[PDB]
Amino acid sequence: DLRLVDITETQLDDVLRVRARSFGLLAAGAREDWVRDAVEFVHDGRFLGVVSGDEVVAAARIWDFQQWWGGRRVPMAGIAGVVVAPEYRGRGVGSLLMRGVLERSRDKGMPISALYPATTVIYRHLGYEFGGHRYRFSFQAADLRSLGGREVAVRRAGAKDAARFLELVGTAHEASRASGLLVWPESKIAEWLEDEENFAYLAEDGFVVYNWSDGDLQVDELVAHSEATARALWATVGSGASIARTVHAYLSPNDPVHLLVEHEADKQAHVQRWMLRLLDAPAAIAARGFAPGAAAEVDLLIDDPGVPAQSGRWHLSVADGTGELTPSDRSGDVLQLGSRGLAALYAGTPLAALRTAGLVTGGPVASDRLLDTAFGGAAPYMLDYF
Amino acid sequence: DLRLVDITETQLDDVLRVRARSFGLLAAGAREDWVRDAVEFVHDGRFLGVVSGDEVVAAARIWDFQQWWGGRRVPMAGIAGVVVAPEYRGRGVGSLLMRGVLERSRDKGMPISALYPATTVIYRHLGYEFGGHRYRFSFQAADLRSLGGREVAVRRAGAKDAARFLELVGTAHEASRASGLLVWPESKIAEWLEDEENFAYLAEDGFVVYNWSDGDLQVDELVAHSEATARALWATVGSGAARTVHAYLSPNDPVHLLVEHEADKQAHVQRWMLRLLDAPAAIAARGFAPGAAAEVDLLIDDPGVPAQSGRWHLSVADGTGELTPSDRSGDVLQLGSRGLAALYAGTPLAALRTAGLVTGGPVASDRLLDTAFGGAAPYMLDYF
Amino acid sequence: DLRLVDITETQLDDVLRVRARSFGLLAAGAREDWVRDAVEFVHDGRFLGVVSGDEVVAAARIWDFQQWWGGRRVPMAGIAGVVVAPEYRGRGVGSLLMRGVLERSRDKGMPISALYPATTVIYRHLGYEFGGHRYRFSFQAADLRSLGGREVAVRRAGAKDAARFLELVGTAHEASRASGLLVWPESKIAEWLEDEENFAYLAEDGFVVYNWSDGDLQVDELVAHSEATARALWATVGSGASIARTVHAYLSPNDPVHLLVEHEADKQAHVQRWMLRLLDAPAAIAARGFAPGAAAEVDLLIDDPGVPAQSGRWHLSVADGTGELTPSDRSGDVLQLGSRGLAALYAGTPLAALRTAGLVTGGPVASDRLLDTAFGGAAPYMLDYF
Amino acid sequence: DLRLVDITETQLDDVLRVRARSFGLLAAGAREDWVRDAVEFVHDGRFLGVVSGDEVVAAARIWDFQQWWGGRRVPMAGIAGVVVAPEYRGRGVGSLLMRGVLERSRDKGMPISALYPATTVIYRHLGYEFGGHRYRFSFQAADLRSLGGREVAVRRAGAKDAARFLELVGTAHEASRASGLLVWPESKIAEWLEDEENFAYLAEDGFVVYNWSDGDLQVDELVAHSEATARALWATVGSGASIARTVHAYLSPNDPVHLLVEHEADKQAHVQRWMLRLLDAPAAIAARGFAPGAAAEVDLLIDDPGVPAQSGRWHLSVADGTGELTPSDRSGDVLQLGSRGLAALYAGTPLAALRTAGLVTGGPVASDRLLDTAFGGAAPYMLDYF
Amino acid sequence: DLRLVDITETQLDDVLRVRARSFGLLAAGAREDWVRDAVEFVHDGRFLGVVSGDEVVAAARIWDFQQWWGGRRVPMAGIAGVVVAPEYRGRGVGSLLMRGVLERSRDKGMPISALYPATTVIYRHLGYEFGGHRYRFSFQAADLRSLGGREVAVRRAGAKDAARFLELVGTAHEASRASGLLVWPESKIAEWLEDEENFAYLAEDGFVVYNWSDGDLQVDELVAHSEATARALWATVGSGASIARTVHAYLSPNDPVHLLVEHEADKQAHVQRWMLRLLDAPAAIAARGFAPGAAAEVDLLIDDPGVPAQSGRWHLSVADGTGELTPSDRSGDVLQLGSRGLAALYAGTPLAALRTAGLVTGGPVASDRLLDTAFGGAAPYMLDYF
Ligand SMILES: [Cl-]
């Protein structure tokens, strides 16, 4: 029968052997790198599995990310590589694994969690719901070329510039109160900057990173504070583009390029969705940034069989960009939500769509205006996939 | 030797000839129809053109629209079918025509205007800027069928049900303080439901209209106030034997929280532009974020429409806004027509600054402006 | 059993019947149009068919064209709509038909003939060989929109401007010593010009005609002497180009648009070939323009079973831009060639290619060069399909 | 601030670093091959660069080619691998580089230069203009298989046959009076025949080389004197094609295969263009072969600020297949050209097109006709890309 | 001069070079597996070739399969890897090789031969004809998942199970009187399951093997005796199908999935054909199973210049599932067959089709009912391609 387990650096082959049944083998190249990058998860309590008898039959790992929510950085458990063997169909193997993944994360002090679901039913059942997007837009390289900004000094960047990149990014997001985006460890970011096939460029108030990994020029991140720098960095890109007509870029759907280029992005675009769950509701609220003008005094009834600790009646108290979540004895027409409703609300989804989706019931409409302006802001997005 | 003009009914054939230079001829069917509603624009003085001597060399028409903004209805000139004859390249014809269009829209009391731009340059120079999106998502019909809802009563609907649809929509959008959506004249909703190519269904608290498209199904509009009704109408669209269902909707629509399979990663994302014609009127009509408050000065520089140029005070409180003349002095937010239209449409000041659409002013009070103008990103359902 | 016949008015529904079995039925207005055109061919002895008993079983028509050679207009028979009932496969109907066609063409005085072959085998046996090209190139609409020539007066053209179109092009081709191009009757030009699907524009020293029939913008023809008019006419096309990235165009590869435009035409091009036959070789030599400065006195041995009238040893005298092909009494080594080699040579194919292809034998290789320069010049092409 | 430099053996990794940022990383196999082929350029003063401090920021190499023009071999400088670091956009680095390359090419006594232009604008400013084409045609494999010549002997060929290939080609191009085709050093030819993935076959009066490197069969070059040998070599290719419908082929636009094959080549073809420049016009003229029978005596006013040594008024004297350009003290109206006009004229672009595209002005039109005669012949082409 | 040989191990590199001219180079990883698998063919005398003096010029190899016909196993020579150098075109090297192949097969005790034909012409001339099919059908992954049978025990399988797989399939095919299917040797089957790229599962009365080698999920073989097992196995396929919408399967058109699954297979399916040849008619007949309760006594006249040994009049006797072919000296109108007709009949093609195709002629059309019934049953098919 079924046993939760900590994957050893040994049994990585077993994990790959399971994974293969659903995805086929890796190239011997991509395989050597998969294994090299797994060891860190293994020796930091961040690679879990399910064993049946003496046989690894399921596995999942946990990134220790941080994530911007309203301009603050909240520790989050990014779940990836969930695999279950096909001959263990419908024996609730995935649920045991995921129940272990969840408490491992709660134990390590991650008040929230996120993933890209391969299917949605299994994750909705454990209390996840959609929280944001990843957008990919396509541009014409010639357009990026004629943006100008030739006076701006742009140089090539390497791993010695990681401190500088974090600084620029953390300044930008804190200003705009961004939500959804990943914070990568300064360590992990230097590696990215050392990658022979990663091209990174630094101006005084911005940077750009792009790659050629698929026959196509792709921009992974652009950050720029002034118009000048923005035009220089995009022109550096359009200039690296050789003769290719088009260039892809991961960016917010509010990004200033759209306001700068002469041809609109191509109508064909990529829209992905990622999911969110709260693991420690008070803590998540504590770390969150709230819209600076927000007053809100609201009670809410929480039903979370999966994390009973945060189940019950609570009062939300927010003002001055900060929030607190505390138990409550009150007795009124309160708001009722489950883990999904609770995660979706944290993610700034409008209460109208949540009532229509049945993810929340009850309470007065006065409260709906409040939480909409409190949890409101720019729509959550990220640039990464995992 | 060029002059702005009101298109008459007999000049329509000439407009179609100009149109053919850029688009090719209309099929016999689609021509007959084009002329049908062209007549209406002519009659309501919403069909402008440019003549050189005694022959048409450009035209454009003005939809008598209304557009949602913060859960309130605002009169807006939707500009469509802009065409210029090719031999008049480089003589500024398009620009002369559009200034004709701005003035007529202004004179008919529409404080804002919107359009889908074929090219960005001419329209940005007339003061328009991107203001929202139209999104198309693609679902598998099987996934909508699984939604269920079959316990909810749903009957076939038609033209006679137009009034009731309008109640249902208005309730939905007021409740969600929606932004960006068209309100069409009830004659066009009339001919919409009348069309046998369109399939309408109605429940106690929702409706849906859809049709065939290249062998797939397309949802024009779905409104549902409750979960069971949404399940019921999506599952209706998805009933059958038609694998793919396309839908026009916001990225925050509740479908995405119900359907067990995510919409296709490949999506269509188009943009439409906006311009203010009478800023104070536009402000007065707009709905503002509940519990938002702002009291700041603005410097508007708009050579295209000088009446809204100069310094203004903006007052927002209790969901209502007001724009009044200011003679004060000192550092302030400066906006051209483009920055102003994008701000009205909820675009965050950071972007406007990085794009050079806005400069100056204490960057700390950007916060109050973002908040007052914020809310659900503006989108719409239709193309025009 | 089968016999050659002149197609009559009341036999046109039958031709259409045969047509539909190979190509499918026409639309209903296409028929009304197809019929009206045909009637002209019937009343001028230019629509031949083959009947079996009382049934029409094949048919073909003869355009009364002219074609440019070395800057001169040469009368020519353009063969169109060769159609055969599928039931009458392998019975020689095609050959019988074509020989009738060839005969009707000499009888009407056309020294040369041309067509677009659906298959090559039958035509090669009857004496046609490839003689020229039709090129379609693809440009960016944006490149055209910015060529300039802003002051050049350019107006809508229509059926009244037909003679002026033929006038501009006449001086253009006489100048360049052009070869290959079609000379349509003024009547046909006028119809082309007045067609509401076609969009013509006129200036003091040029014109352009284009259309949107594909769904793509297609340039049928552009002519312009001076630089400014060339830039202006292309700029007109660029403005009719809507949001279409791409515009196609039928033109020479010597066309100056390649030297004017900023981005090279697309690599993906359309190259079609048309075939040629001499029917009265002394007459075709007399009518041809010959390269300026070019001179040669050589003998030729022609073997043409298909048209015995032009078999035998001739002598061609060439100087001052004219030629003449007289019966020759000489004897010795002499370049011999058949109908195919005779036509390709007239078309200015290199003798080296003709020898290797085996369409020419014997003769001193010394006087090969003499022939090359006589028939040399800009390579033959046309803009039309038929 | 930047400096023109000769790339040294130590700087070769630097060059690949620049190359990577606009073509993508080189796979370990291809990189060693890049290095082996780069040392020759380095140690013969044919690898230029631009340096900023001690960073390489741009590079280009010069092939020691000869190019056919009118039957004779003219030494030429082929420019390849032009690369400029993305951050150095809008700073004239490309021009700093190319001027060095032009200067170096002139010192080494190559009177002409050619390249394939990624973009037209910068090279046109440096005085290059389109001179010829590369064509690729598509054929049905079955049509080739049956061309015959069953008795012709054909064997595998290899490096040791290099000299024999060069002999056979040289014979052909001399008789045909060819223009545009490359002459490779025998070393490079032997390297080409040596490659295990190029398939080469030798006959008594011809050869063919083809390959499978793209999922399609592609003919690089086929040379054949007689009809039987042309048929044999094409049928050899046809047996190579296996079950594939189509075979692609780089050929002259006048290649005999079009007269031989049963189904016409596909309509869809590839048409690319290369550019040319004169570096030393009197030498370039003296090396050129000229049209047989052609005579000309005509003055010529050249304006080339980019190479002042060839500016001023010259006399073109053309007779007996030989030309000479001498300084002329005459006065009066005369054809004027800058570098682009001069190169395109030398390539035999018709005067008409030159005038319409504004590259040539002035002059009696008497000059035009004799000049079109003087530079005419088969249209310039080549089989190779570089 | 052309000579047939047995390929030795030291000639395998020469074989690959011949293969290369027709299929392009083998990826270095694919090349070593090829040489690996080639040696077993060499050491068992089942790799033939043709040499020209010293050089290898063509090759082919022979699988020692068995093939089901009417529920009995018949030894059969499966031909694969036919290659001829492209320069030896038109010299009949293919025929000389194949005649070699046939003779070796006949020597090794194999009464029949099968192959997938690249072209039909050469194999028909040698006596082969289409005898069966291989079908691929496409199903919704979700429909496979919801088939149920989760109570049924299903484990992962390895080479250990090889004996058992042969056992399960053996009894299934004897039951159904199967024709067309392959019998791999047990060793080839253990190596099959050992392959880390194949995923195999085993139940008490059935198994399934699938893989991901093309980017898609593909079922190589499924077998299942009970309904619950058929259900569980398809469910295992469904589970391992990841997020992929559709799965492909190789099976009979009469397979039981079509009766179980709720959405019909896609209209779009793959249908390949394989050919058959009799090498020794009395042996092949004696090994074949015949239809239950069919009887026949009838004379046949075989005309096989390829294999003279089997020409002449024969008597066919069929009773109680067994048939025997004896020589006859009777006279009188009888059914006449060449090698192709003889194969098609054996394969179960109906006599009416053989008559319209002209593969068969003569004889009382009445007795055709006997023959059709005797050779009849479920249509021959195969899961494997070789
Ligand atoms: Cl093989």
Instruction: Please give the C-alpha separations between residue A279 and each of A81, A180, A289, in angstroms, as whole numbers.
Output: 20, 17, 18
Q: Please give the residue of chain C at the shortest CA–CA distance from B117.
A: C243
Q: Would you say residue C158 lies in a domain?
A: yes
Rounded CA-CA distance B75/B65 in Å is 6
C-chain CB neighbours of D253 within 8 Å are 133, 379
Rounded CA-CA distance B252/A379 in Å is 10
Selecting from D197, D213, D240 the residue whose C-beta is nearest the C-beta of E22 gives D240
Rounded CA-CA distance D85/C358 in Å is 54
Entry resolution (Å): 2.6
Q: Please give the residue of chain A at the shortest CA–CA distance from E239.
A: A86
Rounded CA-CA distance C24/C15 in Å is 13
Rounded CA-CA distance C16/A55 in Å is 75
Contact C338/C303 with Cβ under 8 angstroms? yes
Contact C131/C380 with Cβ under 8 angstroms? yes
Q: Closest by alpha carbon to C122, among C58, C46, C34, C54?
A: C58
Looking at E247, E277, E307, which one is the last position of a domain? Answer: E277
Selecting from B119, B227, B354 the residue whose C-beta is nearest the C-beta of A225 gives B354
Measured from the Cβ of residue A330, the count of other Cβ atoms closer than 10 Å reads 9
Q: Would you say residue D98 lies in a domain?
A: yes
The string of DSSP codes covering C330-370 is --SS-EEEEHHHHHHHHTT--HHHHHHHTSEE-S-GGGHHH
Instruction: Please give the C-alpha separations between residue D141 and each of B312, D156, D235, D246, E118, in angstroms, as whole numbers.
Output: 76, 20, 9, 5, 14
How far is the centre of ligand 1, averaged over its atoms, from the C-alpha of E15 (Å)? 8
User: Could you tell me if E300 and E372 lie in one domain?
Assistant: yes
Contact B72/B52 with Cβ under 8 angstroms? no
Measured from the Cβ of residue C204, the count of other Cβ atoms closer than 10 Å reads 12
Q: What is the Cβ-side half-sphere exposure of residue B321, based on CA atoms within 13 angstroms?
A: 28
User: Could you tell me if B362 and B247 lie in one domain?
Assistant: no
Rounded CA-CA distance A343/C366 in Å is 91
User: What is the residue whose two structure tokens read 């705009």?
Assistant: A176
Given CB atoms, is A53 within the 8 Å cutoff of chain E? Answer: no
> Is the Cα torsion angle D252, D254, D256, D260 positive or negative in sign?
positive
A383: DSSP letter: S
Q: Is A154 exposed, middle or buried, given 0-12, 13-18 or 19+ CB atoms closer than 10 A?
A: buried
Buried b (16+ CB within 10 A) or exposed e, A183-221: bbeeeebbebbeeeebbbbbbebbbbbbbbeeeebbbbb
- The reply to whether residue B368 touches residue A263, judged by beta carbons under 8 angstroms, is no
Rounded CA-CA distance B289/A369 in Å is 9
Q: How far is CA C12 from the centre of its chain?
A: 26
- Tell me if residue B188 falls in helix, strand or coil: helix
- Tell me if residue E160 falls in helix, strand or coil: helix
Q: Would you say residue C383 lies in a domain?
A: no
Given CB atoms, is C156 within the 8 Å cutoff of chain B? Answer: yes
Rounded CA-CA distance B149/B153 in Å is 9
Contact B264/B138 with Cβ under 8 angstroms? yes
Q: Please give the residue of chain B at the shortest CA–CA distance from A231.
A: B355
Q: Would you say residue E384 lies in a domain?
A: no
> Is the Cα torsion angle D192, D197, D202, D208 positive or negative in sign?
negative
CATH number of the CATH domain containing E296: 3.30.1050.10
The string of DSSP codes covering E207-268 is EEEEE-TTSSEEEEEEEESSHHHHHHHHHHHHHHTTT-SEEEEE--TT-THHHH-SSPPPS-
User: Could you tell me if D141 and D267 lie in one domain?
Assistant: yes
Which segments of B203-354 does DSSP mark as H helices, in order? 227-237, 255-258, 279-285, 337-344, 349-354
Rounded CA-CA distance A327/A345 in Å is 18
Answer yes or no: is E82 a known binding residue: yes
The string of DSSP codes covering D148-179 is --TTS--EE--GGGHHHHHHHHHHHHHHHT--
Q: Which of D1, D14, D83, D89 to mutate to test the interface with A (most CBs of A within 10 A)?
A: D89
Rounded CA-CA distance A66/A185 in Å is 8
Contact D62/D106 with Cβ under 8 angstroms? no
Q: Closest by alpha carbon to E379, among E79, E131, E37, E92?
A: E131
Backbone torsions φ then ψ of C77, nearest 5 degrees: -95, 105
How far is the centre of ligand 1, averaged over its atoms, from the C-alpha of E18 (Å)? 9
Selecting from D85, D91, D118 the residue whose C-beta is nearest the C-beta of A242 gives D118
Contact B141/B236 with Cβ under 8 angstroms? no
The string of DSSP codes covering C265-287 is PPSEEEEEEEEEEESSHHHHHHH
Rounded CA-CA distance A205/C339 in Å is 76
Instruction: Please give the C-alpha separations between residue C167 and each of C161, C189, C195, in angstroms, as whole numbers.
Output: 10, 12, 20
User: Could you tell me if E119 and E151 lie in one domain?
Assistant: no
Relative to beta strand B333-336, strand B294-301 is: parallel
Is residue D203 within a helix (H) or strand (E), and if so which, with residue range?
Answer: strand D199-203
Q: How far is CA C76 from the centre of its chain?
A: 9
- State how many domains chain E has: 3
- The reply to whether residue A292 touches residue B371, judged by beta carbons under 8 angstroms, is yes
Q: Please give the residue of chain B at the shortest CA–CA distance from A366.
A: B290
Q: Closest by alpha carbon to B310, among B292, B323, B293?
A: B323
Q: Is C322 exposed, middle or buried, given 0-12, 13-18 or 19+ CB atoms closer than 10 A?
A: middle
- The interaxial angle of helices A162-176 and A186-194, nearest 10 deg, is 120
Residues whose Cβ atom is located within 5 A of ion ligand 1? E 81
User: Between residues 97 and 126 of chain D, which touch chain A (CB distance below 8 Å)?
Assistant: 118-119
Beta-ladder partners of E182: E67
Who's near A249: CB < 8 A, 6+ residues apart?
Answer: A136, A137, A138, A139, A218, A219, A222, A257
Rounded CA-CA distance D314/A3 in Å is 94
Q: How far is CA D333 from the centre of its chain?
A: 34
Q: Closest by alpha carbon to B109, among B79, B77, B139, B132?
A: B77
- Tell me if residue C160 falls in helix, strand or coil: helix
User: What is the residue whose two structure tokens read 């009532």?
Assistant: A355
Q: Closest by alpha carbon to D126, among D340, D309, D301?
A: D340
Rounded CA-CA distance E238/E208 in Å is 12
Given CB atoms, is A156 within the 8 Å cutoff of chain D? Answer: yes
Rounded CA-CA distance B236/C236 in Å is 51
Count the helix, strand and coil residues of chain D and give each as a percent rounded to the nearest 5: 35, 30, 35
Measured from the Cβ of residue A14, the count of other Cβ atoms closer than 10 Å reads 17
Q: What is the Cβ-side half-sphere exposure of residue B352, based on CA atoms within 13 angstroms?
A: 29
User: Could you tell me if D29 and D68 lie in one domain?
Assistant: yes
E-chain CB neighbours of D243 within 8 Å are 118-119
Rounded CA-CA distance E181/A368 in Å is 68
Buried b (16+ CB within 10 A) or exposed e, C136-174: bbbbbbbbbbebbbeebebebbeeebbeebeebbeebbe
- Tell me if residue E47 falls in helix, strand or coil: strand
The string of DSSP codes covering A100-141 is HHHHHHHHTT-SEEEE--SSSHHHHHTT-EEEEEEEEEEEEH
CATH number of the CATH domain containing C184: 3.40.630.30
Is residue B192 within a helix (H) or strand (E), and if so which, with residue range?
Answer: helix B186-194
Buried b (16+ CB within 10 A) or exposed e, B352-363: bbbbbbbeebee
Backbone torsions φ then ψ of A134, nearest 5 degrees: -125, 125
Rounded CA-CA distance C305/C312 in Å is 11
Q: Is D1 exposed, middle or buried, given 0-12, 13-18 or 19+ CB atoms closer than 10 A?
A: exposed
Encoded amino acid at A295, one letter:
A
- The reply to whether residue D89 touches residue A212, judged by beta carbons under 8 angstroms, is no
Task: Kindly compute the dihedral angle of the four CA atoms of residues B290, B295, B299, B302, in this order, to the nearest 10 degrees.
Answer: 30
Looking at E271, E302, E322, which one is the last position of a domain? Answer: E271
Relative to beta strand D246-250, strand D217-224 is: parallel
User: Could you tell me if D92 and D217 lie in one domain?
Assistant: no
Answer yes or no: is E125 a known binding residue: yes
Q: Is D326 exposed, middle or buried, given 0-12, 13-18 or 19+ CB atoms closer than 10 A?
A: exposed
User: What is the residue whose two structure tokens read 């099919």?
Assistant: E133
Given CB atoms, is E290 within the 8 Å cutoff of chain A? Answer: no
Rounded CA-CA distance C293/D374 in Å is 10
Structure tokens of B194? Answer: 């009348």
How far is the centre of ligand 1, averaged over its atoms, from the C-alpha of E39 (Å)? 13
Rounded CA-CA distance C73/C289 in Å is 9
Measured from the Cβ of residue D308, the count of other Cβ atoms closer than 10 Å reads 9
How far is the centre of ligand 1, averaged over its atoms, from the C-alpha of E82 (Å)? 7
Contact A201/A208 with Cβ under 8 angstroms? yes
Given CB atoms, is C47 within the 8 Å cutoff of chain B? Answer: no
D381: DSSP letter: B
User: Could you tell me if B221 and B245 lie in one domain?
Assistant: yes
B-chain CB neighbours of C154 within 8 Å are 87
Selecting from B253, B268, B292 the residue whose C-beta is nearest the C-beta of A293 gives B292
Q: Closest by alpha carbon to C118, among C142, C75, C84?
A: C84
A146: DSSP letter: T
Rounded to a whole number, what is the distance in angstroms from the first to the last CA of chain D? 31
**Where on the phi/psi map is residue A44: left (φ > 0), alpha (ψ -120 to 50), or beta?**
alpha
Report the helix count and the strand count for chain D, using DSSP H and E.
13, 18
The string of DSSP codes covering C285-323 is HHHS---TT--EEEEEEEE-TTSGGG-EEEEEEEETTEE
Instruction: Please give the C-alpha separations between residue B240 and each of B142, B200, B236, B237, C75, in angstroms, as whole numbers.
Output: 9, 16, 9, 8, 65
Measured from the Cβ of residue C89, the count of other Cβ atoms closer than 10 Å reads 9
C-chain CB neighbours of B22 within 8 Å are 240-242
Looking at E246, E271, E296, which one is the last position of a domain? Answer: E271
Rounded CA-CA distance A189/A163 in Å is 9
Q: Would you say residue A386 lies in a domain?
A: no
Q: Closest by alpha carbon to A341, among A327, A325, A358?
A: A358
- Tell me if residue A229 falls in helix, strand or coil: helix
- Tell me if residue C104 falls in helix, strand or coil: helix
Q: Which of E144, E197, E199 to mutate to test the interface with A (most CBs of A within 10 A)?
A: E199
User: Between residues 301 and 360 of chain C, which touch chain D (CB distance below 8 Å)?
Assistant: 340, 344, 349-350, 352-359
Q: How far is C228 from chain D (nearest CA, A)?
A: 8
User: Could you tell me if E235 and E311 lie in one domain?
Assistant: no
Q: Is C29 exposed, middle or buried, given 0-12, 13-18 or 19+ CB atoms closer than 10 A?
A: exposed
Relative to beta strand B182-183, strand B56-69 is: antiparallel
Experimental technique used to determine this entry: X-ray
Contact C283/C316 with Cβ under 8 angstroms? no
Structure tokens of E43? Answer: 């050491």
Rounded CA-CA distance C206/C152 in Å is 11
Buried b (16+ CB within 10 A) or exposed e, B309-332: eebbebebeebebebeebeeeeeb
User: Between residues 6 and 25 of chain E, which touch chain D (CB distance below 8 Å)?
Assistant: 20-25
Q: How far is D167 from chain E (nearest CA, A)?
A: 22
- The reply to whether residue E199 touches residue A21, judged by beta carbons under 8 angstroms, is yes
Q: Which of C239, C243, C245, C247 to mutate to test the interface with B (most CBs of B within 10 A)?
A: C239
Selecting from E23, E89, E91 the residue whose C-beta is nearest the C-beta of D242 gives E23
Q: How far is CA A317 from the centre of its chain?
A: 26
Q: How far is D383 from chain A (nearest CA, A)?
A: 22
Relative to beta strand D112-115, strand C55-69 is: unpaired
Encoded amino acid at A338, one letter:
G
Which segments of chain E does DSSP mark as H helices, in order? 12-23, 28-42, 93-107, 121-126, 141-145, 162-176, 186-194, 227-240, 257-260, 281-287, 339-347, 351-356, 368-374
Rounded CA-CA distance C239/C141 in Å is 8
- Tell me if residue E361 falls in helix, strand or coil: strand
Given CB atoms, is A291 within the 8 Å cutoff of chain B? Answer: yes
Rounded CA-CA distance C44/C33 in Å is 18
Rounded CA-CA distance A19/A82 in Å is 9
Q: How far is A36 from chain B (nearest CA, A)?
A: 30
How far is the centre of ligand 1, averaged over its atoms, from the C-alpha of C2 (Å)? 54
Q: What angle do CA E271, E276, E280 make, to 5 degrees?
A: 165
Given CB atoms, is C144 within the 8 Å cutoff of chain B? Answer: no
User: Could you tell me if D196 and D240 lie in one domain?
Assistant: yes
| Structural domain that includes position E337 | 278-377
Chains that touch C (3 or more CB pairs under 8 A): B, D
Which segments of E3-76 does DSSP mark as H helices, in order? 12-23, 28-42
> Is the Cα torsion angle A369, A374, A379, A385 positive or negative in sign?
negative
Backbone torsions φ then ψ of E5, nearest 5 degrees: -145, 175
Selecting from C176, C254, C293 the residue whose C-beta is nearest the C-beta of D294 gives C293
Rounded CA-CA distance A104/A62 in Å is 9
Contact B36/B26 with Cβ under 8 angstroms? no
User: Could you tell me if E137 and E263 lie in one domain?
Assistant: yes
Q: Is E366 exposed, middle or buried, given 0-12, 13-18 or 19+ CB atoms closer than 10 A?
A: exposed
User: Could you tell me if D149 and D266 lie in one domain?
Assistant: yes
Who's near D355: CB < 8 A, 6+ residues apart?
Answer: C227, D361
Given CB atoms, is B265 within the 8 Å cutoff of chain A? Answer: yes
Answer yes or no: is B95 a known binding residue: yes
Q: Is D166 exposed, middle or buried, given 0-12, 13-18 or 19+ CB atoms closer than 10 A?
A: middle
Measured from the Cβ of residue B380, the count of other Cβ atoms closer than 10 Å reads 23
User: Could you tell me if E91 and E187 lie in one domain?
Assistant: no
User: What is the residue whose two structure tokens read 């993944």?
Assistant: A101
B262: DSSP letter: P
Encoded amino acid at C276, one letter:
L
Q: How far is CA D183 from the centre of its chain?
A: 9
Q: Would you say residue E383 lies in a domain?
A: no
Q: Please give the residue of chain B at the shortest CA–CA distance from C241.
A: B22
Rounded CA-CA distance E193/E191 in Å is 6
Contact D85/D94 with Cβ under 8 angstroms? no
Answer yes or no: is B206 a known binding residue: no
